[PDB]
Symmetry: C3
Subunit: 342 residues, 3 copies
């Protein structure tokens, strides 16, 4: 974050990164140049000495296709909020679902990771139209104790009776919903719950998954001290985990764990394991691995603005009828990255 | 905006806003998350004692749809200009049509309003390829007397005989045209005029509206003193007001009026009324309300960088065959917004 | 550029321009409003005394179409690199292919020019996934002598056997390739340059377009430049094999490209310019044989108010004829006048 403005009670931080990034894989849909950049603005204004206003916007700009290519940029975040002393904060916009308050603890790999869930995937990650109340250190009474309460209105179909103004396809639709999170402290533990109504299209068009509500239950653990980082994340889902392109898993059990070490000279090796186990899938699928891989990588930090990394995704999925029909990659991937950040 | 750069005779201002915005309506194409942001740059260079150069770019970035959604960002403004002492200024680019010099006076509602016209709508709002000459205080000789002269070259069809490089659909096309405005802060009075050629596609593809020329005639009045803001605008148009999706109104009579009070502690209540009366519509439509509503709302300004608002569009249109076939919404809307501004 | 941040060893230069721009032409696909803007960031971090990290992003935002129009903005450059003192620099991302190291010398017209090649056109201009090594002054041993070494992985088709993640159409595809450049600033203002590149072609390039067949794309370039005493002269000659676009018809099996320009910079701000460009395709299939792919004279001028504001006129005097080749290839044969007014930061 680069502070480019600080005057008359308002401050502007520009931030982002340019990632010179290349994948090598036998999977032709992921193989090759993956260069992209992120640019963002973070602003806050002191209204009075107890009230602060703020806004944040974050933009992704792909740079791996041509100048005539289509749909190469999109907004990751955009929200405005108010925070009042110890009474908490409230923001609204496109922001992270509060489930990520805990699952982000394992989303720290050099390149891969964080993919037992997706974006626009109920309240598991970045989401449209979330209203989020947060409180740090429980009103100033319990150090290290944080919680959040979140509401999301329906984001429905493009047309018909299920429509909203901002309609999308069924895999990124949501009904009215809410979520909570709680975290507590160099060992931390955390929990999160989310619950969203599912839409009619979601319960009629996809081949897999039927249920009134999408629900997630998460617990997580983190150790962060002495240049060691250990983290684990266990999430049980109902009608909320995508079964690739086929729909949603009626039930899934998602597990992420990671171990990293920071050498003083800048090298940060990382080792991790991720699995998403789908249960009670229709069509004879039954129990199926939705995700399963070991990840071995390393990032070298030249300083806080320059790094380079390699990441090896060791894919442990078998190619079977489920991964084939669902469009799920079973190939290994090697990622090489050179990153300038500000 | 925020001056982020001022060196060796050149200054840059960064400006914009993040609007956490939600609509509540029975109209499913309107109801839902409407979060968006704006970002712009305004540049100005001192060339010599009397001549300054300038440029400005304004970008709208929607943030209410997914990261895989399309067509989510667009340029509202982009122009470059020169200003010479009291002799006036010239600029060319994507800029406001001079009709907005007067109609902007009623475009002050918390969220709604300004919609008896649209963008890329001849010289009524933001438009491609406008060359604009402006003079304030009449060459320095008459305080408060401003005028503008403006030319716009054809923006034609995508292909065929009527094409230009930057072709678009008939509803946002224009032929060669020109406009003039005059405003006098005598309490202000304003008048504006525009005259454009229509295009062959406007006279053949849509069902409604036929004529060689699009014209508008605008008069406006503004009271802005003693914490009170009152404004009205009346615009008579020919072949220039859109009849929703069905074409243009051969004649239309547009009227906007607003009354507002600014409380010292930040609250700014607002009441307004807008109507657009189409005349001589083809296909038996005859005379039709194209727009008709009363608006009640309020903005609370925390400071220059943070505000919040409610706006209530009390829609007075009757649901009939014209509003149905033309895609014109007849439902009330409530907007809630929280805005961070830089 | 405008340096808007420089702290803790990291600096950010925000740069760009807003070009109020209008074309006049009998070609209705060219005529009319052409207003656009560029915006970009050039960033740089001093890692230690000898080692610098850097990144650069450049965005093009059209402003000549409506707010409901599609695909109006795009990324021209995005790369990150390291410079290790006199050992050289390495960057990767979307960047210029090293052929442009020499052909850029003629890319100086007020509005037109630089179009015997295109973008995403092997290593001839801006390109996806280029890894570029550069060395100035030959490890610090020979002032004025620069060279570059570049590699580009395949950017393939959208679907099927030749696909990559970042697929595109045949005119903008490439196989694995490499290029090299070498320039020497001879004395007071005279430079000579050479560039070479060699890429594999893709299957769709050998099947979808009507013209051009070959396993390999190859370019050979030499250039000359004079840049002193307010005079700017430059020329470049490039011979290509399976690498110059023949409009929408495909690729020319061979092409011979030539550009030459002469400009003078008045101190009061006026910069007149005259130039000539041609691209001659040879051995085209389907009876075309030898054809002019590009041929025009350019006359224009730019007036600099200062470093942040300018205006120009540019007049493309098009010498191509309307024939079945130019018709079927979609190549414009009409004259064009451009009028621009530019704010720069
Ligand atoms: C403000 O005045 C608006 C009303 O004036 C009407 C303009 O007259 C139109 C002139 O041509 C119309 C021919 O019927
Ligand atoms: C000129 O002043 C315009 C008068 O306001 C129009 C509102 O009344 C319209 C009823 O036809
Ligand atoms: C002349 C005083 C201006 C009156 C404006 C009042 C706005 C009322 O809206 C309140 C809701
Ligand atoms: C003071 C401004 O008050 C505006 C009224 O707000 C409308 C509330 O919307 C409720 C309608 O169902
Ligand atoms: C020798 C002919 O082979 C064609 C080479 O294609 C370009 C790939 O070269 C990359 C090796 O550095
Ligand atoms: Mg179920
Ligand atoms: Mg008429
Ligand atoms: Mg050949």
């Amino acid at each position: 974050g680069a502070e480019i403005y600080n005057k008359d009670g308002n401050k502007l931080d520009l931030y982002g990164k340019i990632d010179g990034l290349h994948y090598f894989s036998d999977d032709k849909s992921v193989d090759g140049d993956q260069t992209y950049m992120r640019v963002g603005v973070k602003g806050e204004t002191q209204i009075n000495d107890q009230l602060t206003g703020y806004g944040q916007w974050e933009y992704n700009v792909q740079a791996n296709n041509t100048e005539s290519s289509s749909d190469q940029a999109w907004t990751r975040l955009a929200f405005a909020g108010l925070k009042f002393g110890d009474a908490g904060s409230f923001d609204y916009g496109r922001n992270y679902g509060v489930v990520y308050d805990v699952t982000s603890w394992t989303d720290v790999l050099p390149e891969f990771g964080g993919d037992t869930y997706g974006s626009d995937n109920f309240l598991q990650s970045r989401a449209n139209g979330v209203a989020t109340y947060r409180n740090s250190d429980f009103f100033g009474l319990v150090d290290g104790l944080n919680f959040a309460l979140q509401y999301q209105g329906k984001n429905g179909s493009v047309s018909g009776e299920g429509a909203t103004n901002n309609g999308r396809g069924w895999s990124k639709q949501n009904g009215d919903g809410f979520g909570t999170s709680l975290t507590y402290d160099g060992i931390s533990a955390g929990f999160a719950y989310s619950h969203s109504k599912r839409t009619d299209e979601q319960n009629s068009v996809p081949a897999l998954g039927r249920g009134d509500n999408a629900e997630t239950y998460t617990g997580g653990l983190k150790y962060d001290a002495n240049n060691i980082y250990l983290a684990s994340q266990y999430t049980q889902t109902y009608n909320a985990t995508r079964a690739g392109s086929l729909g949603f898993a009626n039930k899934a059990q998602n597990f992420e764990v990671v171990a990293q070490y920071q050498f003083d000279f800048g090298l940060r090796p990382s080792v991790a394991y991720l699995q998403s186990k789908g249960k009670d899938l229709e069509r004879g699928y039954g129990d199926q691995d939705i995700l399963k891989y070991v990840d071995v990588g390393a990032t070298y930090y030249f300083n806080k603005n320059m790094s380079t990394y390699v990441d090896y995704k060791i894919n442990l999925l078998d190619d079977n009828s489920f991964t084939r029909n669902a469009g799920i990659s079973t190939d290994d991937v090697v990622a090489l990255g050179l990153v300038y950040q500000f």
